[PDB]
Design an enzyme around this catalytic site. Structure first.
Site, PDB file in Angstrom:
ATOM      1  N   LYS A 187      90.119  17.129  33.387  1.00  0.00           N
ATOM      2  CA  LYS A 187      90.693  16.140  34.309  1.00  0.00           C
ATOM      3  C   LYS A 187      90.839  14.752  33.678  1.00  0.00           C
ATOM      4  O   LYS A 187      91.824  14.053  33.925  1.00  0.00           O
ATOM      5  CB  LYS A 187      89.858  16.052  35.592  1.00  0.00           C
ATOM      6  N   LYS A 227      86.949  15.164  21.929  1.00  0.00           N
ATOM      7  CA  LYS A 227      87.473  15.003  23.279  1.00  0.00           C
ATOM      8  C   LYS A 227      88.214  13.679  23.370  1.00  0.00           C
ATOM      9  O   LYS A 227      87.673  12.630  23.017  1.00  0.00           O
ATOM     10  CB  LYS A 227      86.370  15.064  24.335  1.00  0.00           C
ATOM     11  CG  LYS A 227      86.906  15.446  25.706  1.00  0.00           C
ATOM     12  CD  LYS A 227      86.068  14.867  26.828  1.00  0.00           C
ATOM     13  CE  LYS A 227      86.483  15.435  28.179  1.00  0.00           C
ATOM     14  NZ  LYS A 227      85.937  16.806  28.387  1.00  0.00           N
ATOM     15  N   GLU A 237      79.794  18.178  18.739  1.00  0.00           N
ATOM     16  CA  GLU A 237      79.470  19.451  18.098  1.00  0.00           C
ATOM     17  C   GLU A 237      80.432  20.509  18.630  1.00  0.00           C
ATOM     18  O   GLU A 237      80.716  20.549  19.826  1.00  0.00           O
ATOM     19  CB  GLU A 237      78.021  19.863  18.395  1.00  0.00           C
ATOM     20  CG  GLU A 237      77.543  21.090  17.621  1.00  0.00           C
ATOM     21  CD  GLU A 237      76.282  21.733  18.197  1.00  0.00           C
ATOM     22  OE1 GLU A 237      76.213  22.979  18.197  1.00  0.00           O
ATOM     23  OE2 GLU A 237      75.357  21.016  18.639  1.00  0.00           O
ATOM     24  N   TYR A 238      80.938  21.350  17.734  1.00  0.00           N
ATOM     25  CA  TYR A 238      81.875  22.405  18.097  1.00  0.00           C
ATOM     26  C   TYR A 238      81.117  23.658  18.517  1.00  0.00           C
ATOM     27  O   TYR A 238      80.179  24.082  17.838  1.00  0.00           O
ATOM     28  CB  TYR A 238      82.838  22.665  16.929  1.00  0.00           C
ATOM     29  CG  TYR A 238      83.624  23.961  16.973  1.00  0.00           C
ATOM     30  CD1 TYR A 238      83.486  24.905  15.954  1.00  0.00           C
ATOM     31  CD2 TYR A 238      84.519  24.237  18.012  1.00  0.00           C
ATOM     32  CE1 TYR A 238      84.203  26.094  15.970  1.00  0.00           C
ATOM     33  CE2 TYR A 238      85.245  25.429  18.037  1.00  0.00           C
ATOM     34  CZ  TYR A 238      85.082  26.351  17.010  1.00  0.00           C
ATOM     35  OH  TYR A 238      85.788  27.535  17.014  1.00  0.00           O
ATOM     36  N   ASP A 243      74.723  18.116  36.722  1.00  0.00           N
ATOM     37  CA  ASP A 243      76.042  18.746  36.695  1.00  0.00           C
ATOM     38  C   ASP A 243      76.048  20.108  36.000  1.00  0.00           C
ATOM     39  O   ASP A 243      77.001  20.444  35.293  1.00  0.00           O
ATOM     40  CB  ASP A 243      77.071  17.804  36.052  1.00  0.00           C
ATOM     41  CG  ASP A 243      78.493  18.029  36.568  1.00  0.00           C
ATOM     42  OD1 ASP A 243      78.667  18.576  37.676  1.00  0.00           O
ATOM     43  OD2 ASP A 243      79.446  17.640  35.865  1.00  0.00           O
ATOM     44  N   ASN A 292      80.366  23.408  32.134  1.00  0.00           N
ATOM     45  CA  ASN A 292      79.557  22.501  31.316  1.00  0.00           C
ATOM     46  C   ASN A 292      78.527  23.229  30.459  1.00  0.00           C
ATOM     47  O   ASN A 292      77.599  22.614  29.932  1.00  0.00           O
ATOM     48  CB  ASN A 292      78.872  21.440  32.187  1.00  0.00           C
ATOM     49  CG  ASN A 292      79.845  20.396  32.722  1.00  0.00           C
ATOM     50  OD1 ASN A 292      79.623  19.824  33.787  1.00  0.00           O
ATOM     51  ND2 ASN A 292      80.926  20.145  31.986  1.00  0.00           N
ATOM     52  N   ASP A 336      78.112  17.745  28.452  1.00  0.00           N
ATOM     53  CA  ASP A 336      78.598  16.812  29.474  1.00  0.00           C
ATOM     54  C   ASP A 336      77.456  16.133  30.225  1.00  0.00           C
ATOM     55  O   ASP A 336      77.042  16.584  31.295  1.00  0.00           O
ATOM     56  CB  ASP A 336      79.563  17.499  30.443  1.00  0.00           C
ATOM     57  CG  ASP A 336      80.612  16.554  31.000  1.00  0.00           C
ATOM     58  OD1 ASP A 336      81.751  17.023  31.215  1.00  0.00           O
ATOM     59  OD2 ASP A 336      80.311  15.356  31.218  1.00  0.00           O
TER      60      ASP A 336
HETATM   61  C1  LIG Z   1      86.050  23.411  25.713  1.00  0.00           C
HETATM   62  N1  LIG Z   1      85.303  23.578  24.438  1.00  0.00           N
HETATM   63  N2  LIG Z   1      85.489  24.814  23.809  1.00  0.00           N
HETATM   64  C2  LIG Z   1      84.737  24.808  22.680  1.00  0.00           C
HETATM   65  C3  LIG Z   1      84.102  23.578  22.629  1.00  0.00           C
HETATM   66  N3  LIG Z   1      83.259  23.024  21.724  1.00  0.00           N
HETATM   67  C4  LIG Z   1      82.716  21.674  21.804  1.00  0.00           C
HETATM   68  N4  LIG Z   1      83.099  20.947  23.001  1.00  0.00           N
HETATM   69  C5  LIG Z   1      83.927  21.440  23.925  1.00  0.00           C
HETATM   70  N5  LIG Z   1      84.268  20.702  24.984  1.00  0.00           N
HETATM   71  C6  LIG Z   1      83.836  19.345  25.303  1.00  0.00           C
HETATM   72  C7  LIG Z   1      82.447  19.464  25.922  1.00  0.00           C
HETATM   73  C8  LIG Z   1      81.870  18.114  26.304  1.00  0.00           C
HETATM   74  C9  LIG Z   1      80.658  17.691  25.825  1.00  0.00           C
HETATM   75  N6  LIG Z   1      80.530  16.576  26.360  1.00  0.00           N
HETATM   76  C10 LIG Z   1      81.440  16.073  27.173  1.00  0.00           C
HETATM   77  N7  LIG Z   1      81.330  14.876  27.762  1.00  0.00           N
HETATM   78  C11 LIG Z   1      82.237  14.346  28.589  1.00  0.00           C
HETATM   79  O1  LIG Z   1      83.267  14.949  28.867  1.00  0.00           O
HETATM   80  N8  LIG Z   1      81.966  13.131  29.087  1.00  0.00           N
HETATM   81  C12 LIG Z   1      82.775  12.464  29.954  1.00  0.00           C
HETATM   82  C13 LIG Z   1      84.125  12.787  30.099  1.00  0.00           C
HETATM   83  C14 LIG Z   1      84.933  12.104  31.006  1.00  0.00           C
HETATM   84  C15 LIG Z   1      84.396  11.084  31.781  1.00  0.00           C
HETATM   85  C16 LIG Z   1      83.050  10.758  31.651  1.00  0.00           C
HETATM   86  C17 LIG Z   1      82.494   9.654  32.500  1.00  0.00           C
HETATM   87  F1  LIG Z   1      82.807   8.492  31.960  1.00  0.00           F
HETATM   88  F2  LIG Z   1      83.040   9.733  33.700  1.00  0.00           F
HETATM   89  F3  LIG Z   1      81.177   9.762  32.602  1.00  0.00           F
HETATM   90  C18 LIG Z   1      82.242  11.447  30.742  1.00  0.00           C
HETATM   91  S1  LIG Z   1      82.593  17.082  27.291  1.00  0.00           S
HETATM   92  C19 LIG Z   1      84.468  22.817  23.728  1.00  0.00           C
END
Ligand SMILES: Cn1ncc2ncnc(NCCc3cnc(NC(=O)Nc4cccc(C(F)(F)F)c4)s3)c21
EC number: 2.7.11.1
Length: 255
Positions: free
Chosen positions: A17, A36, A85-86, A130, A135, A148
């Protein structure tokens, strides 16, 4: 002091999103990671700029094999990039759709690995809040890695499906909220859908509030017990992570 020019942008790893996740490679070391991409206009619009800065701070201290690393972040003018990290085996959300439901052996392993990650998180007074399939990510060797920490806070969006009564009502809540969520997860892993699914937000609200859930016929008594002892309206009654880890059904099916 990273910049976009340091990274080779690869294939999309998913859509979110707030932005998209891409596979990436650090040009010097050839290191494989995930980036990201968040938009700055989107972040300032929903007033979450401080939450992202809090997530980075929280993730700069935590180190655990069942927690997806966040290495740091950078921005240019219009976008914010998270160096991540992937997770080679994608999301648990995707694995769940692919398999419909998990067996007890896979479920218990995921709950064991989650409990460990939460045990480390709660000891550092970090609450996730969450916990959901989207996640939860899977590492190279198939281990669960929690990600996340955006909605994370210190002790003490989507659907309501995983949110405890105390959280959905807008009341006080501590580490015990990750325990309710863990309970919800355990149910969806085995059944294929979360225990309080509904077609409307308002009905899901009623179900969670009154803790109205049933088990299908294939769920064993050991799993039935665990979930029932986790999904309790009274937060102070819910099982502890130590009890979860030492639970008979958990010990029996875990690897
Ligand atoms: C899909 N996928 N497939 C393989 C794979 N390997 C590694 N990572 C992936 N995906 C990303 C995973 C995340 C880890 N941490 C996140 N953190 C976050 O999205 N934080 C975040 C975002 C928007 C707004 C806010 C706020 F400000 F509102 F707080 C906070 S997302 C993978």
């Amino acid at each position: 002091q990273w910049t976009l020019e340091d990274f080779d942008i690869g294939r999309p790893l998913g859509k979110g999103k707030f932005g998209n996740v891409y596979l990436a490679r650090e040009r010097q070391s050839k290191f494989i990671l995930a980036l990201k991409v968040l938009f700055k206009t989107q972040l300032e619009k929903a007033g979450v700029e401080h939450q992202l800065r809090r997530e980075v701070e929280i993730q700069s201290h935590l180190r655990h094999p069942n927690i997806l690393r966040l290495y740091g972040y950078f921005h240019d003018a219009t976008r914010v990039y998270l160096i991540l990290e992937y997770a080679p085996l994608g999301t648990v959300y995707r694995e769940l759709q692919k398999l419909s439901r998990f067996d007890e052996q896979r479920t218990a392993t995921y709950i064991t690995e989650l409990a460990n990650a939460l045990s480390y998180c709660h000891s550092k007074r970090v609450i996730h809040r969450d916990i959901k399939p989207e996640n939860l990510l899977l590492g190279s060797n198939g281990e669960l890695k929690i990600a996340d920490f955006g909605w994370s806070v210190h002790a003490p969006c989507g659907t309501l499906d995983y949110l405890p009564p105390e959280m959905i009502e807008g009341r006080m809540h501590d580490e015990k909220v990750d325990l309710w969520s863990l309970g919800v997860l355990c149910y969806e892993f085995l059944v294929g859908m979360p225990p309080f699914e509904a077609h409307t937000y308002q009905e899901t609200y009623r179900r969670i509030s009154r803790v109205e859930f049933t088990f299908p016929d294939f769920v064993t008594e050991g799993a039935r017990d665990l979930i029932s002892r986790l999904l309790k309206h009274n937060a102070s009654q819910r099982l502890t992570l130590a009890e979860v880890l030492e639970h008979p059904w958990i010990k029996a099916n875990s690897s």
